[PDB]
Every structure is written in structure tokens, then in C-alpha cells.
């Protein structure tokens, strides 16, 4: 395990082995490598172009140092333009029919982060591992706040912050779900990452994970047009192109799906749960639809959309019980107040 | 002057402007940029592939901040350095023959690769490698030779030391030394580690204001004139850049077995050198002469390399004495003597 060997290897643009990558990651995460080297390695790593094995190596290193809870039977809706936080809203409909272990963080792009939205609704986003398991059984849903679960990460913080650029770590979050959930919907920000991250995921041991990229470029199912997804399972990777019409609806005006703050997102969500905002509701449903498909609850996406319609109608109540059993219900009520 | 802008620019593989490069260098050298960023910039710089302008920018930033002495009439034999074969320090031995016929301002440094640095060899022979600027000028007049220890005339460099050391890889700085001679040397024989840089650095040098500088790359891959085969050189002057291929035979000798030119320590290099000055090691001596030959050519003392080789033969015969006077006027002569005893005699 010689950093300098590795660094030179990377500069020479030579991909690493899953093992090389994993050891290097462990070291970096454990804070055993000097800031100057981490900086250099990440930069080289990016300029060379991270490869599947390296993604896998790092992913494995990550999982190994995180605080874990066991709920592999759970599903997660993994993760810009500033759209309302669908994944989260969507995690709520899902909790009605299956345990949900939502991995998430605040945002670095103006309040919109799933942790912020939840915090806005009154949810107490800091859930200790012990009570986490409890909540999942008691309500079928729990939020795993990333900062609280990847404490080892602090050792790379300074470098990441100082560099202020995209490193390999930026695409690891969604592949490092604390609860080890086997069922998951994962959004990526670029088609390239679709292929890359899918192949990477194929080796991270998943029952079923669906990666998706939607026009005009979002880490979610496209509300306006084509959505490109990679279905990864124990037996391979399947490509699947899709159009928002295939759900049986007409394209949603992107203008309506955008938010400007955590509370603004919350309101748009709750309004959708009330039937006061069809656009947002449809956005939440085409996404939940794909997730339902990942759970094998439906056979086609149209079926999935339909099912989701039934779910959304019971979602505000579900949300209420979730927040009430871990958070401030009133903050939720004030948000309900026509908002 | 925003580092982060630059960094991103580099990551996106976009070459900088001589000015951009120069300001960035000044900042880094002045130690105004955090270690994490210097590390990132150098790495990006290398993975993108440094360009002429960047080389120039950094070179200018360096000079501007170096401690200087004035001896442009001097010549220097610098090597871009490399991951070569731990070869004997020819440039240095060769600087000695040159002092016989022209002032020599040898730029040089220690080394992390064993102990094969020109500063180490000189230190081994008894030379006092730390020469203050004032006495430096003196020594050059008194003996026609002086060694400018990089760490000492480029004190600003300390600010990038930690990063360079920690990284432990080739950065843009590794190819700046020879282009930043503290004496402003107008004549220079500069050896590049790859046929590539050869062109890059030549074009770069064309704008650094030189009377005549000859860059060279020799098989099987050394920052010196090839003792085994073809040597590729770029002759840069006020009126252009000339390409010149050459073979070790064009000197009138048969290829030297690389095995004989390799060393394992500063003292080992010294001995091999002194032995060559005694006539006890032809292989090393021939290595020293084909190089000195090219340098002589850069000085316009000869018209062809064969002539240069011949002239060098005459020079080497008076070199041990010259070396003696150099060390004796700035160093420990005895250490030199013990080395003379160790190299038979
Ligand atoms: Mg999301
Ligand atoms: Mg050299």
C-alpha cells in the first residue's frame, strides 16, 4: 500500500484494481494519507476518468466504515435545476407498501436537500441507529442522515472543501446506503454516469437497483420527456428507454416543478398530497411508479403510475404518523395550513 | 488571480497564458497558495501536459525571484533530470573540462534518487556547494567555475518543497532548473528526459532569451548525449531552432557499454570521474568527452562534433589539476585527495 506508487500509476492514467482502489479508499477515509496526497489522488482520479473498479473499490471502502443498521428488505430512492424533492415525497408513498430507508443529506445548492425538506415538515432528521431500526418497524420509514452515518468522511472534508470540484466521492453517496437496502431507485446526473455507475453497481451486490437519468438533465424520472434507465440485478444490466407519455400523461411544465427553498418544496409536496397541485403530484407518481417496478409490485410503468395514484391519496396521513412518531407534528400542521 | 478558476481551467485541460502561468507561479512560489491547491494544480498541470506558455510563465516567475549574479558569458551544462539509470554525473565532470576554456556557472541540486545529484558529487569531491553570491562571482574570476546550488539561489522554492516531497512525482518544476540559471548564463547545454519535451522545451527556450542553448535527448532515454546510440538535439538561438540527429559513432568512437556508466552513490560517481581524469576509465572518459564536445560546439569553439570530441580529449588531460585548484579555492582538498587514492592513481 504505497500511495506514491498509486499516484504515479494514476498520473500515467492506469486504472486500479478493485482491491487497490478499496485499500486506497480505506486509507484516505481513515485519514492515514496526507491532505496533499488525497488532493493529488482525487484530481488524478478525475482527470484519468474513474473506472468501474475504482468506483466499486471506493464504494466498498465506504460501506465498510459507515454506521450500519440492518434492513436489506428496505428500498431507498437515491440521488442542479432546483426541482422539488421528489425522491423524498416518493419515499413516503412507498412506505405505505414497503419499508423505506431513505439515505439523504442537506443541500449545497440552496435548501432543497431531502434532509432540509424533511426537517421543514417537522421530521427530526438525526436518528440514532437503535431508534432508526425501531421507527422502520413502527412506521415503515426512516431517514438516514448521511453526515450522521459516514463520520469517517470528516477526514477528506478539508480536501473536498478546499478543492471545490467534483471528485469520485460525489458519485458514491447513493451507492452507500447505511441500511444496506437491496431495493433502490438511483438517479444520476449524466448519461455517461448511467453506464459507469450501473456497471459499478453490478458489483456492489444489489437485489435490484434502477439507475435513471431524465431530460432535460436530472437525477430523476423525466417529467418532460425521455428517461434513460439501467436495471441492475444479480443476473445483469438491462437498458430501458422511456418517455413521460408511456405513463399515460402529458409532459409536465418544468416551470411548475421548481422550488426556491426547503419550505417551498414542502408546501408543493403537501399540496400534491392534498390534490391541490397535480403537476407536482404527477412528478411524484411517475417516479414512485419506477420504484414500485423495482419492487416487483407492478409489471409495467403504466400499472406503476396507477398504483401510485392510490398511494398518494393516503400519503399525507402517512406523513403525519411518521413526523408525529419522530418530530414536531405542529410544524407539519402549519405547513398544511393551506400550504 | 483566482486559483480555483485556474484549477478548474486546468482540470478541463485548457492551457494557460504566459501571464496566467506566471502569476500562478509567483503565487505558489511566494507560498500564497495552500498546499492542497498547489498539489492539485501541479497534478492537473502534469496530467494535462504542460505547454510552452506554462513552462515560460513558470520559468519567468522563477527567475524574477531568484538570487542572481551576473555572468551571462558563462556556460552551464544542465540536465532536465529523470528516472534514468542512475548514470554518472557527466554534466558536472564535463563542466570541469569547460572551465579550462570558458567561465562555467553550473546550476545544480542534491537528489532523492540514491545520491546521483551534481551537488552531491561535488560535495563528495570536497567542494563547498554553498557559495554566497558575492564569493560566487569571485570564484568564477579566480577559477573560471562556480556551482550555484539551487536550494540556495532559489530560496523562494522552500514554499513548494513540502508538496514536491510529499507528492514524490515529476511536476513542472523538475524541468525548470536549467532554464533558471542564477547567473543568467547565455550559453547552455540542456538534456531532456524524453524525445517529447525536447520540442516543447526548445520552443519554450526560444522565448527565454538565450544566445545559444542546446537541448538533447539520448538513447536509451537520458538527459544527456547518448553513449550508446542516437542523440536528438535542438539548437536554439536568436534566429531560430535547428533539429540535429546524431549517433555516438559520429564522434569517431564505438558505443560505450551502458553498464560501465552507471553509479550507485555520490562517492562512486566521484571515483569514476577522477579515474577518467587519470586515464584509468576510458568508458567514463568517452562519456564525458562526447558531452563536452557538444558543449564546445555550443560555444562555437569547434565546427563539428568530431572536432569537439578531439578538443575535449586535450581538455580532460588537464582536468584533474583544474579540479584540484577549484576545490582548493573553495572546499576541502584532502577529501579530494582521498578520492584520488580511492581511484587508484
Ligand atoms: Mg433524488
Ligand atoms: Mg545533464
JSON list of C-alpha atoms in Angstrom, two decimals, chain A residues 4 7-8 10-13 34-37 39-41 43-48 158-159 162-165, chain B residues 4 7-8 10-13 34-37 39-40 43-44 46-48 83 162-163 165-169:
[
{"chain": "A", "resi": 4, "resn": "UNK", "atom": "CA", "xyz": [3.17, 7.35, -4.29]},
{"chain": "A", "resi": 7, "resn": "UNK", "atom": "CA", "xyz": [-0.41, 8.35, -7.57]},
{"chain": "A", "resi": 8, "resn": "UNK", "atom": "CA", "xyz": [2.15, 7.73, -10.31]},
{"chain": "A", "resi": 10, "resn": "UNK", "atom": "CA", "xyz": [-2.95, 7.24, -11.85]},
{"chain": "A", "resi": 11, "resn": "UNK", "atom": "CA", "xyz": [-0.96, 10.08, -13.42]},
{"chain": "A", "resi": 12, "resn": "UNK", "atom": "CA", "xyz": [0.07, 7.57, -16.07]},
{"chain": "A", "resi": 13, "resn": "UNK", "atom": "CA", "xyz": [-3.66, 7.04, -16.49]},
{"chain": "A", "resi": 34, "resn": "UNK", "atom": "CA", "xyz": [-1.70, 13.42, 3.91]},
{"chain": "A", "resi": 35, "resn": "UNK", "atom": "CA", "xyz": [-4.02, 16.11, 2.54]},
{"chain": "A", "resi": 36, "resn": "UNK", "atom": "CA", "xyz": [-1.58, 16.87, -0.25]},
{"chain": "A", "resi": 37, "resn": "UNK", "atom": "CA", "xyz": [-1.76, 13.30, -1.49]},
{"chain": "A", "resi": 39, "resn": "UNK", "atom": "CA", "xyz": [-5.80, 16.13, -3.18]},
{"chain": "A", "resi": 40, "resn": "UNK", "atom": "CA", "xyz": [-3.45, 14.80, -5.84]},
{"chain": "A", "resi": 41, "resn": "UNK", "atom": "CA", "xyz": [-5.07, 11.38, -5.98]},
{"chain": "A", "resi": 43, "resn": "UNK", "atom": "CA", "xyz": [-7.50, 15.17, -9.01]},
{"chain": "A", "resi": 44, "resn": "UNK", "atom": "CA", "xyz": [-5.63, 12.48, -10.93]},
{"chain": "A", "resi": 45, "resn": "UNK", "atom": "CA", "xyz": [-8.52, 10.11, -10.41]},
{"chain": "A", "resi": 46, "resn": "UNK", "atom": "CA", "xyz": [-10.87, 12.63, -12.01]},
{"chain": "A", "resi": 47, "resn": "UNK", "atom": "CA", "xyz": [-8.62, 13.62, -14.92]},
{"chain": "A", "resi": 48, "resn": "UNK", "atom": "CA", "xyz": [-7.98, 9.99, -15.78]},
{"chain": "A", "resi": 158, "resn": "UNK", "atom": "CA", "xyz": [-10.97, 19.70, 4.19]},
{"chain": "A", "resi": 159, "resn": "UNK", "atom": "CA", "xyz": [-9.61, 18.47, 0.86]},
{"chain": "A", "resi": 162, "resn": "UNK", "atom": "CA", "xyz": [-10.73, 23.33, -0.46]},
{"chain": "A", "resi": 163, "resn": "UNK", "atom": "CA", "xyz": [-10.65, 21.75, -3.91]},
{"chain": "A", "resi": 164, "resn": "UNK", "atom": "CA", "xyz": [-14.23, 22.77, -4.60]},
{"chain": "A", "resi": 165, "resn": "UNK", "atom": "CA", "xyz": [-14.70, 20.36, -7.51]},
{"chain": "B", "resi": 4, "resn": "UNK", "atom": "CA", "xyz": [-9.94, 27.81, -8.16]},
{"chain": "B", "resi": 7, "resn": "UNK", "atom": "CA", "xyz": [-7.57, 24.75, -11.20]},
{"chain": "B", "resi": 8, "resn": "UNK", "atom": "CA", "xyz": [-10.89, 24.16, -12.96]},
{"chain": "B", "resi": 10, "resn": "UNK", "atom": "CA", "xyz": [-6.59, 23.01, -15.90]},
{"chain": "B", "resi": 11, "resn": "UNK", "atom": "CA", "xyz": [-8.85, 20.09, -14.99]},
{"chain": "B", "resi": 12, "resn": "UNK", "atom": "CA", "xyz": [-10.78, 20.93, -18.16]},
{"chain": "B", "resi": 13, "resn": "UNK", "atom": "CA", "xyz": [-7.41, 20.59, -19.86]},
{"chain": "B", "resi": 34, "resn": "UNK", "atom": "CA", "xyz": [-2.46, 26.45, 0.20]},
{"chain": "B", "resi": 35, "resn": "UNK", "atom": "CA", "xyz": [-0.60, 23.15, -0.06]},
{"chain": "B", "resi": 36, "resn": "UNK", "atom": "CA", "xyz": [-3.78, 21.36, -1.12]},
{"chain": "B", "resi": 37, "resn": "UNK", "atom": "CA", "xyz": [-4.16, 23.65, -4.12]},
{"chain": "B", "resi": 39, "resn": "UNK", "atom": "CA", "xyz": [-0.71, 19.82, -5.05]},
{"chain": "B", "resi": 40, "resn": "UNK", "atom": "CA", "xyz": [-3.86, 19.84, -7.18]},
{"chain": "B", "resi": 43, "resn": "UNK", "atom": "CA", "xyz": [-1.03, 17.27, -10.63]},
{"chain": "B", "resi": 44, "resn": "UNK", "atom": "CA", "xyz": [-3.53, 18.75, -13.07]},
{"chain": "B", "resi": 46, "resn": "UNK", "atom": "CA", "xyz": [1.07, 17.27, -15.35]},
{"chain": "B", "resi": 47, "resn": "UNK", "atom": "CA", "xyz": [-1.93, 15.22, -16.42]},
{"chain": "B", "resi": 48, "resn": "UNK", "atom": "CA", "xyz": [-2.95, 17.89, -18.92]},
{"chain": "B", "resi": 83, "resn": "UNK", "atom": "CA", "xyz": [14.16, 8.39, -13.94]},
{"chain": "B", "resi": 162, "resn": "UNK", "atom": "CA", "xyz": [6.68, 20.03, 1.20]},
{"chain": "B", "resi": 163, "resn": "UNK", "atom": "CA", "xyz": [4.27, 19.48, -1.68]},
{"chain": "B", "resi": 165, "resn": "UNK", "atom": "CA", "xyz": [8.46, 15.99, -1.44]},
{"chain": "B", "resi": 166, "resn": "UNK", "atom": "CA", "xyz": [5.10, 14.57, -0.36]},
{"chain": "B", "resi": 167, "resn": "UNK", "atom": "CA", "xyz": [3.87, 14.06, -3.91]},
{"chain": "B", "resi": 168, "resn": "UNK", "atom": "CA", "xyz": [7.08, 12.32, -4.93]},
{"chain": "B", "resi": 169, "resn": "UNK", "atom": "CA", "xyz": [6.47, 12.67, -8.68]}
]
